[PDB]
Design a protein around this ligand. Sequence first.
Ligand SMILES: [Ca+2]
Ligand SMILES: [Ca+2]
Length: 97
Amino acid sequence: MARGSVSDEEMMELREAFAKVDTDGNGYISFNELNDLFKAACLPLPGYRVREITENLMATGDLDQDGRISFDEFIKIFHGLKSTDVAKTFRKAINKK
Ligand SMILES: [Ca+2]
Ligand SMILES: [Ca+2]
């Protein structure tokens, strides 16, 4: 078992995932990055859909409620919340699908 640890593979995946959208390399992911990311994916989906996954992901991804997600934050939600839609969509989208 594990509280919030992260495996080698999983960790790496998350690292690159954050560094991907991180154009300035600050280690933070705001709502603009999440939306622009899922939106940039260019998939057969409506507007409320992408806006929902991004809105929910951010709301359930930000504990301090500042408007930015940190490495630990995202990774934590991934190791915490079970198989979710926003999670899979993130790892996939961020990975260019
Ligand atoms: Ca950034
Ligand atoms: Ca925060």
